[PDB]
Amino acid sequence: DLASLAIYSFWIFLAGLIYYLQTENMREGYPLENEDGTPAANQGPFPLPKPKTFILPHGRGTLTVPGPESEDRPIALARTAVSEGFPHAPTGDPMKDGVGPASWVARRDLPELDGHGHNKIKPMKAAAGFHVSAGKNPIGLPVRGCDLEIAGKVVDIWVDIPEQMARFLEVELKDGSTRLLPMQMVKVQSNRVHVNALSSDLFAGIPTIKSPTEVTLLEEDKICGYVAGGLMYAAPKRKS
């Protein structure tokens, strides 16, 4: 009857919806590769979708996906085995080389803009009208590493202007040079900012930004990558 026609129709609808959904989710990372970068023989039953093009907002151009995929960078890794499916060892220092938990991607070397075309993320000193409104103010606080040594001190908060939100703390090293630490990787305490991911001696190694009043999407990725990677790689120097 009408009911079992509906339910039968629905199951066919749902299969085509699953198909559409899965192919939609193949616009990045595909086609699949062998560990050496050549196209894998078995792609699975789903085809790559017809490409689509995003018109990016601020004269920044076009993105078409799926498109030609490449890491626009060297990968310092080597096979540990003669067959597929095993770990690939770092050939140098994985923090510096940017592999493993320390990975970054070659994102565009421009900063993210807001809807009005202005830098999304600014230092708060250069940010008109922005102040700490609640919680402990971190600015001026010393910064500790996972080895319980002081690495530096906070000299500003970089804020997301549209989201009105702290994204980085800017930290001054014994150099007098500064680095960015991501907010999501620091514990703002009563008397200090604590950083579990990194030990004091790795703060110098944090990638630096090339202008001091903006971060680029490429630089955000190299910084967040570096400091996350310390959870694994700075675990010798971690005490508590």
Partner: protein, 301 residues
Amino acid sequence: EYQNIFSQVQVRGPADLGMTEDVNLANRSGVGPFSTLLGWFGNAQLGPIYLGSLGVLSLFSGLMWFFTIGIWFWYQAGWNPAVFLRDLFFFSLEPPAPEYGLSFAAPLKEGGLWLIASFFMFVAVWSWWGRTYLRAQALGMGKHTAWAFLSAIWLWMVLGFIRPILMGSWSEAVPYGIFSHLDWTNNFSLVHGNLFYNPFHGLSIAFLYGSALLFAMHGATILAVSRFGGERELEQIADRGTAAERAALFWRWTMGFNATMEGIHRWAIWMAVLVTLTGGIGILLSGTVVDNWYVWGQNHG
């Protein structure tokens, strides 16, 4: 480490007046107060709400539907506020009896107030829907929010309007009351041979369970990659970063496949939309085409 459920440090600056685009700035309000309370979790700004012509129609109708039920609850309470507060969940505005069919000629103390309140709800919802569409056209955005909302409208539309009409009676509709609309729901299942046997009801459940499953997955995933600025999803679509890669790879390594940053939101909007879509079909077929889902299930047909 820090988990990122509440912000450690709040930060305020100048009230944000929003993107202009094609919006009639004349109809926007002024930025309201900043809530420090709200800003530990989300934004602090209770800033501007756009109140156009449709917004006022919707808000007037809504309060009218809301007050129509309310005066009736007082008439039942004997105008005594102590009884009103004692029996609040027990009061009920019920539809017209089967006698009056699909007619509007019927006394107020016998379903007339029900028709009135329902008319007001009908215009409150559809105007708000048009508002959801128009609000998006002004900003030049796609109409996704308006389509997803149409799906919720569907179940609602079926329960109170479409299905009462195909049965030829307003008595088949849901009454206005906390405990009574619950009773109606239990009663409905009982009168149709146990709704657990309705194959659309069970699909609706799969999608509802799956909505909690998906958002648990997605939300937890964005929090896990927020240390690489994963929440900035829109830019991560235009220019994939390491946040989107370790998010995809977590799931590929766990269950053998993965989404994209855009793709996960198509999964999301559909999983939810199908809740009330299949649900509305399951209710519409009950009492029009299938009298008893136990019986139907024995010989599907």
